[PDB]
Structure formats: C-alpha cells, structure tokens
Nucleic acid binder design. Structure first.
Ligand SMILES: [Mg+2]
Ligand SMILES: [Mg+2]
Ligand SMILES: [Mg+2]
Ligand SMILES: [Mg+2]
Ligand SMILES: [Mg+2]
Ligand SMILES: [Mg+2]
Ligand SMILES: [Mg+2]
Ligand SMILES: [Mg+2]
Ligand SMILES: [Mg+2]
Ligand SMILES: [Mg+2]
Ligand SMILES: [Mg+2]
Ligand SMILES: [Mg+2]
Ligand SMILES: [Mg+2]
Ligand SMILES: [Mg+2]
Ligand SMILES: [Mg+2]
Ligand SMILES: [Mg+2]
Ligand SMILES: [Mg+2]
Ligand SMILES: [Mg+2]
Ligand SMILES: [Mg+2]
Ligand SMILES: [Mg+2]
Ligand SMILES: [Mg+2]
Ligand SMILES: [Mg+2]
Lengths: 116, 79, 177, 136, 52
RNA sequence: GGGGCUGAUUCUGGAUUCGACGGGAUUUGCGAAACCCAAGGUGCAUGCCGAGGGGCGGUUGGCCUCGUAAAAAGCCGCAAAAAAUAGUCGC
RNA sequence: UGCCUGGCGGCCGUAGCGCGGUGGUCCCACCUGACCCCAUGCCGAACUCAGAAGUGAAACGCCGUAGCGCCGAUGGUAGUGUGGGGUCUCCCCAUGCGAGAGUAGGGAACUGCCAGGCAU
RNA sequence: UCCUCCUAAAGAGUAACGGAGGAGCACGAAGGUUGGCUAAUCCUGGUCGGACAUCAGGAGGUUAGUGCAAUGGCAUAAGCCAGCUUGACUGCGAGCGUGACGGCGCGAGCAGGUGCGAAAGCAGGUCAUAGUGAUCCGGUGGUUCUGAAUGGAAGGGCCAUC
RNA sequence: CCGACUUACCAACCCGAUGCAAACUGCGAAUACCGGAGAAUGUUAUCACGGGAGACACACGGCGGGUGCUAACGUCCGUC
C-alpha cells in the first residue's frame, strides 16, 4: 500500500518529465539500500546507475542505509555521467520527500558536476 | 388560448474536431475545441484554458489511444 | 512498557502452542489504544469542549485533538466543521503505560465492577469498551470536576480473530466474565 | 388501467414504431398469444383482454402480460387552435412489433387456452396468433 | 448588497492604479497588495483607495 | 375556458404546543417464554381409548379427573339487564 | 549462458479478481529504538535518521487451479448508400458495407534496459 | 439578453407560442506554487448517543465531491488540508477557431520585474461553458502633446477609470 | 380461542430470467465531412479583387423527424 501511494504521488512528476522530454535521474530509496540511475528521455533506456549493492562502492562504507553512502553513490554516478558526457539532467524524487538520504545524494550529485 | 414555458435556448459554441487528424498544422493552431478533456494533450500539444488542444510545433496530427485508462491522446509528429 | 517486556515472551509461548503457530511474527499483537471524549451536547457552550480536552489530557498526558463533524446530521441540528469531542491515540510506549494504569488502577473509583463484557469484539477483536465516568482514573479527582463524562476506550490489536484477541486479553489478565 | 408510477419527464416525442420484435418466444408459461401485425396497444385494451382471459379460464392457472404501457400519448383539447405548447397527457400505450408475445399462460389445457385467447384477442386492434412453447 | 468597486493606487510618487472589486461588509480591512508599477518598472505596495 | 393574488404570523431555511395523549432508546426486580436445566422430596404419572362441561353451550381436547370410563372444572359466551352522562332551566 | 529478485518503460480487460502453498544464500517488506534535523494541526498511523536479533506472520513475488471478470470466430439477423417496386404510419428485389448480443473456442500475459545475488 | 440537454438525421450549423432547467453572482481567498491526503453507502463492537454524530475494524471503489442549473471531465487528481505569497503583473505576440459586421475566444514565445519549489518547472485568475450593454455626452488622476499674435491658462487629444 | 393456517390481495435488499427510453449507453454500422497519394475526364468549372444587380412571401414529392389525431392540397427543420 505504501509503494502504491508512493507511485501515485510520483507519477505526476514522472509524466511531467516525460512530457518535458529531458533526462531524469531517479532515486530508489529503501531503509537498507539506496539506488540511483539516469534514464534516457524515451524512458526505456538506462545510461548510468550506481548503488550501495555493489562492492565497488560498498567496501569503503560503514552501512549502506545512511546519508554517507548515498553521498558516495551520488558522487560516483555524477562522475560517471560526466565522463560519459551526461551533464544536464533533472532530479526525480520518485515519491520520496526531498530530505535526509535523498537530499544528501542530490546535493552530492549537484556538487560533483551534475547541474540540476 | 394559453401559455407555454421552456421556450429558451442557447447559442452553439461550434465545438468538435477541427483538423480531423492526418493534416499538416502550424504552431499555435487549434486542433480540438471541447468542454471537458475528452482528448488529452500528448507530444507537442498544449492545453488551453477551456481544454483546447493547440499544437506548439508544425507537423502531423495523430490520434492514438494510450494510458492505463485507454484515453485518447493527440500527438504532433514533427516530421 | 513494563508489562510489555515482562509478558511478551510468555504470551508468545502460550499462543504459539495454543493456535499451532510457526513464526514469532504470527502471534497476535497490540497496535494502539484510542480514547474519545464524545462531547455531543456542547454546541451551545464551547466551554464543555475545553473541559473535555483538559480532563482527557489529565487522564492521559497529551493534547486531545478537537474533532470536527463531517456529515451535519439534522437529528441534533449540527453543521460540519463545528467541534464535537476530542480523541487521543497512543502507540507503543505510551500505549503500554496507559494499559497498565487501565488494568491495575481502574477498580477503586468504579462501582458494581463484576467484570467486563466478553463480546466487545468488532469481528476482528479490537475490544472497544466504554466507561461511564472520568474520576475512575487516579489522575482526576472529584473535587476539581464540574461535569461528569465517560470514555469510549478501544484497544486496537493485531489479532486476526475475536477468539485470538480474547486469548490475548486473558493472557494480559484483563477482568472478563 | 396500469401505468408507470413516475417518470423522469411527462411528455415524449411521437417516435416511429418500425423494426422487428425482441421477445418472440414464451419463456414463462406453456401457451401464448402473440401479435402478428403492427400497432399500439393501450392500457385499457390490455386490461380488457386480461379480464376476458381471466374470466374465461376462471383463474385456473397463471397469466403473464409480457407488454407494458409506458409511452404517454397526449391529445390537445377540443376546439383549440394550433401551437401554444404541447397537449396534456391523455393515456399510455405500448409500442408493438410483429412477432412480439403479448400474453402467456400455463396449467390450462390446450382447448381451454385456445378458447380463452380466442375471445381475449377480440379486445385488441392488432391481429394475434396462438403459439406453444418449444424446446428452444 | 453587491461587490463594491475599489481602486488600488500605487504608494510611489506616480499616480498609477489598478481597479478591482471588493465586498466591504465582511472584510472591512483595506486591500493592501504588491503590484507591478509600469511607470517605475518595480513591484511596489498598492494600498486601497476609493473609486472616486 | 384561460391569467394575477392567497394557501406565510411568517414572508428573513432552523417554533421543544411547557402541559396529557403514540413511539423510541438509557438506568432496575424477575415468571421455561426476560431465562438454560431432573435433583433435593422420593409418588404412583408422561402418553396411550378419554366424559361433555357453572343455570345453558363451548376453546388447541386436555387446563379436571380416573382406573379400564363419568360427574365434567381451572376460562369464554347468557351474563352487570348502575350505560344513561357539565351549568342554567316549569307545575 | 539458464534461476529467481530490484529499478525504468512498451503493451494498459486474453494485461484483472477468488482458491490451493511455496520463496530468504541475495534484493524488498515486517522490525529495534530514537536527544539529534525532521515529523503528527494527539500519537514515529505516514517522512526520516541510526541497523540487522528475528520472521516471510501480514505484504511483495512465483507455480497451478475454468469459480468469475474478459477476448471473442464462421454462419445467421437487424440496419443502409444507389437504382427499381408493393397492399406505402410499413415492407420487396438487384447491389456493395454488413453490426450488437448470444454459440464454437481462447485464456491463469508477453516484452526492452541496466543493477546486483546464484550454478557455469 | 446569455448558458446546459434533446429534437439536430454519428464533422460544423440547423426552426417552432417544442420538451426540460438556470444565469443579471460570490471569492485578497474560493487564485499561484510546494508538500501531503483520498469518499458516498452499508455491516460489527462500544457511556450517555437515539433510523442519526464523535470512535475502532470490515464490505465497496468514485455508485461521493465540484460555490451554483445542466452537459462534457477530473486519481498525475480539476476532489480535501497545511506553509509561503499576489502572475487576479506591464507592453507585445507567430498561429488558429468562431461571426455579414461591430466583435468574442484559445494561444507557444519575447522584453522588464515578481511568487512558489533544492531543482526540473508552474503562475497573464478561479475544471470549462451564463454572471452581461455599442455609440454619444460628461466626471476623476497623469500625460513625451495640441495652446487660433506672443508666454501661460481655458478647452481638446492620449493613458487608466467612472 | 392461541388461530390449524393461505384467505382468486399486497409485499425492502439479494439473485435468475423478460421488455421499454429524444433528454440511458459496457458496445456500435452504411452514409455524411476533412486531410494525404494516383490515373482519366470536364470551354478554370476553383480562389481574390473591382463595376452592376436581383432577392430575404416559396410549394409539392422522396427520405429522418417535432408539432397535429404517424388527420389535412395544415405547419415547422435537414438533403435531392
Ligand atoms: Mg505469506
Ligand atoms: Mg457474420
Ligand atoms: Mg459480432
Ligand atoms: Mg459474442
Ligand atoms: Mg451534429
Ligand atoms: Mg499536488
Ligand atoms: Mg527561490
Ligand atoms: Mg465553474
Ligand atoms: Mg445617444
Ligand atoms: Mg495663446
Ligand atoms: Mg488639460
Ligand atoms: Mg449529420
Ligand atoms: Mg461582384
Ligand atoms: Mg456586389
Ligand atoms: Mg431574412
Ligand atoms: Mg423580410
Ligand atoms: Mg412573393
Ligand atoms: Mg421553406
Ligand atoms: Mg422536403
Ligand atoms: Mg415526412
Ligand atoms: Mg401532409
Ligand atoms: Mg402556409
């Protein structure tokens, strides 16, 4: 039910981004892990992703479910987007209120080159 | 003799489909005039104050049925 | 949460073997405790709402939420949006703290306490029961009160069935018949 | 006379009664009287036919009136001019299409059914015919 | 009664103003707003004044 | 055969007829019909054919019966055939 | 390369309900407690910020169930654009277009990206 | 006089002293942004409390609601709350729809300055359609003007508005 | 008498069937109308501007209808 409500309150932003036809960086947030990935404007192709489920950024993090890991994930995904040429991208809350872990990840991504 | 009521009426607003689909339109051209959102705005289609769909770019008008509720959408193919 | 920490393992052990459970989470649990000072005949004077919101605060330390009507029933000549009663809901620690007070110190100030009804379950066993006075609670005395109003307590539990809720309450030593 | 208890609107357009019937087979009783022509049956005619068949069969069974008068027919008062609104409601009719079943019954024998419908049909303008229920 | 017509004049030195409606029986307080001033090209506070 | 005004003590959308008389629900005692039971007493009955009943006739035929069926008596009708009725008001 | 899990979409009523019981090495959920920084117009019912003691009990997901909802032929029927007719409040023929409902049947979804956990 | 449904014959339009109803408003919030939320009805339990309120659970999914009459829509919600605010801005405006005409309406985008949102973005009133009246004559404030010899003034024009 | 009981009677939801609706549509034609491509034919028959008019009393039949009585060589709409 909570997931359904989140989808209900996020599909408005989903449709807004789709009709704007820009690139969107989405954030899946769970109490244990937090993912992040950019999506092509058509909404069916993934260009870059980063999360706490990978050893690459999991071996230097105390716990996955905290703002510190989200910041590292945002830094890594922003660096990969910059090295692949992706620089302009909007940020999708995916229904999660902009505060805490998602806010820290968005700030790290903004600070690591990816301008929103 | 006698008197009868309900002799009043209202002027038609000339609603309906204007381009009928498959035509070449210009920027700002009104596609459909309607009271409610029977047809929803799609690609390069703006919604007016009175739910009028106006094209924001020249191209082709296309009728399709998408969405989870099988709603009709007007799409501007900028070919 | 003294009763919580003391009786949780005991009631789990009892109920698992009673109902042939297979997991710890399957034992019926306690969700919340709700109480509404249903002050209806208070349209003429709003001071009754303040008195209710003070008596309920004294009974359970919080700020009662002044509820508003949503239907405007003409049988009492009321309009929606007017304050009618005040509800207080307690979760977890406060729920347990109020539960022990309603279990232990509830008898001395009430009369003819021959037990409580065993059929107060709303199908799913949520145990809504009512009391006819407020001075039953030790916090509120009789010298400082002007009116006499009761409560509509409801101990909402996670029990699947009414018999499971009854077994839940019996293990929590509540005075049934 | 039977008529709807209430309607959304009092007056209705004249309309046209063209097409074929919808209920053309007996589904309740065993014998039936069904209209073969085209016309409009009125509530008074329906009541007269029902009374005739009931008194012919002595209520030794059951009767089903498949049709129901629901179309209000209005006529202007005598000696008035044209226009000045629509005339007040006068009576109620039921549109009838060829092949539609009008009356149904069971229990009574074939001879009694055919001798009752024979006299009950003379109270209706539309010509009718007698049929028996079959297996599909 | 009906809605009275009022004029919101700019607090600046210019005499620019806007026109609007008002119900001066349930809202006796004056209609002070912030409106754009074409004369000075700045958003300034407009007090409410009579339609005279 | 057609129009206008009344069907309002209020026109301005929120009368406790103050009271007796219907109906609701809340707080009290009890009678197998507001209860669900054979256990103390340890007697001769459940039902099985039941006889026509106060002066007269009668109720699911058993509320009354017993020996192998008869008076029937706990109610209902005839019956109480005081229901003849404010104040003023003639010889 | 095959197992299932997560995220984003296409397709949005053969793609959805009811019943049967499985899933935890991964991922998700339940959950612990909470001064922070955030929150309840009362309560961590919801947001969250610190995590892994336990559980798959509710969910979520998966496999079969024809009890449902639905998709629905061929043929037939109703309707009709043209021309020509009758007994003309309606109907016939030569022509093409041919519905809706109901039968036979189908059916317990396919499919594109990465992101890991599995045997290889 | 204007609006909604049908007659109106599946584009637009289409008449009658035809059948049915409304409009001559309200709102500095009933607008803008952001965040959050999802009923009508019915069943069970519960102190007054009742065919009815305020509560706890369940059946059901828009059968509720739109400030209003009706039609078309609304779940991303156009339906309901909370915080900030005045875009209910100024001058324009490619294009289009509807009218014989006077006219009316939709509208991307540009320049200046704002409100909300971290941001992407939204705001030139209200879910849309009724809520309205040409011209003349005059009133009010400004005016980069006109000023009948000159310099002003009177008056007129221009802009906003009655 | 409790009434044994159905007394040519009426009787909420829930299900199973049977019909009706211009102001009902979970569905849905032909024709009508717009646009894109192509041959053949038609004295440009198409559009824009200017000069000049005339005209805003129509009727009947066919088709789908309101009104009327599916009555009128009656009346009101749309096409030929
Ligand atoms: Mg399970
Ligand atoms: Mg066929
Ligand atoms: Mg078919
Ligand atoms: Mg079929
Ligand atoms: Mg039309
Ligand atoms: Mg929103
Ligand atoms: Mg800002
Ligand atoms: Mg509106
Ligand atoms: Mg004049
Ligand atoms: Mg001069
Ligand atoms: Mg001057
Ligand atoms: Mg047409
Ligand atoms: Mg000319
Ligand atoms: Mg000319
Ligand atoms: Mg004319
Ligand atoms: Mg004329
Ligand atoms: Mg003439
Ligand atoms: Mg004519
Ligand atoms: Mg004609
Ligand atoms: Mg005709
Ligand atoms: Mg004629
Ligand atoms: Mg004439």
């Amino acid at each position: 039910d909570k997931k359904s409500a989140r989808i209900r309150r996020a599909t408005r932003a989903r449709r807004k981004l789709q009709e704007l036809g820009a690139t969107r960086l989405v954030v899946h947030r769970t109490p244990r892990h937090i993912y992040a990935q950019v999506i092509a404007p058509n909404g069916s192709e993934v260009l870059v992703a980063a999360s706490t489920v990978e050893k690459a950024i999991a071996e230097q993090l105390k716990y996955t479910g905290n703002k510190d890991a989200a910041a590292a994930v945002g830094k890594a995904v922003a660096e990969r987007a910059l090295e692949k040429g992706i620089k302009d991208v909007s940020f999708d809350r995916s229904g999660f209120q902009y505060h805490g872990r998602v806010q820290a990840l968005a700030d790290a991504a903004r600070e690591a080159g990816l301008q929103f | 003799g006698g008197s009868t009521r309900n002799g009043r009426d209202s002027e038609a607003k000339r609603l309906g489909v204007k381009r009928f689909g498959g035509e070449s339109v210009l920027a700002g051209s009104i596609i459909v005039r309607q009271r409610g959102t029977k047809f929803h705005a799609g690609a390069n289609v703006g919604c007016g104050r009175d739910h009028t769909l106006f094209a924001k770019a020249d191209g082709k008008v296309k009728f399709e049925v998408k969405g989870p509720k099988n709603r009709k959408f007007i799409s501007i193919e900028a070919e | 949460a003294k009763l919580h920490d003391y009786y949780k393992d005991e009631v789990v052990k009892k109920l698992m073997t009673e109902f042939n459970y297979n997991s710890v989470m399957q034992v019926p649990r306690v969700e919340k405790i709700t109480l509404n000072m249903g002050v209806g005949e208070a349209i003429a004077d709003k001071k009754l709402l303040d008195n209710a919101a003070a008596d309920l605060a004294a009974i359970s330390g919080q700020k009662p939420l002044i509820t508003k009507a949503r239907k405007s029933v003409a049988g009492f000549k009321i309009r929606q949006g007017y304050p009618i009663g005040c509800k207080v809901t307690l979760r977890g620690e406060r729920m347990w703290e109020f539960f022990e007070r309603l279990i232990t110190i509830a008898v001395p100030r009430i009369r003819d306490f021959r037990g409580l009804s065993a059929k107060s379950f709303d199908g799913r066993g949520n145990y809504s029961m009512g009391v006819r006075e407020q001075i039953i609670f030790p916090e509120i005395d009789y010298d400082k009160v002007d009116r006499v109003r009761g409560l509509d307590i409801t101990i909402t539990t996670t029990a699947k069935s009414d018999e499971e809720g009854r077994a839940l309450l019996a293990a929590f030593d509540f005075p049934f018949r | 006379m039977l008529q709807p208890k209430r309607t959304k609107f009092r007056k209705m357009h004249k309309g046209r009664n063209r097409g074929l019937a919808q209920g053309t087979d007996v589904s309740f009783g065993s014998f039936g009287l069904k209209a073969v022509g085209r016309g409009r049956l009125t509530a008074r005619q329906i009541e007269a036919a029902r009374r005739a068949m009931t008194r012919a069969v002595k209520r030794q069974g059951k009767i089903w009136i498949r049709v129901f008068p629901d179309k209000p027919i209005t006529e202007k008062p005598l000696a008035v001019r044209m226009g000045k609104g629509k005339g007040n409601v006068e009576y109620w009719v039921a549109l009838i299409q060829p092949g539609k079943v009008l009356y149904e019954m069971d229990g009574v024998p074939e001879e009694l059914a055919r001798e009752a419908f024979k006299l009950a049909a003379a109270k209706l303008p539309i010509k009718t015919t007698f049929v028996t229920k079959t297996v599909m | 009664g009906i809605r009275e017509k009022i004029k919101l004049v700019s607090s600046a030195g210019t005499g620019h103003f806007y026109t609007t409606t008002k119900n001066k029986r349930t809202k006796p307080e004056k209609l002070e707003l912030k409106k754009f001033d074409p004369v000075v090209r700045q958003h300034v506070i407009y007090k409410e004044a009579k339609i005279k």
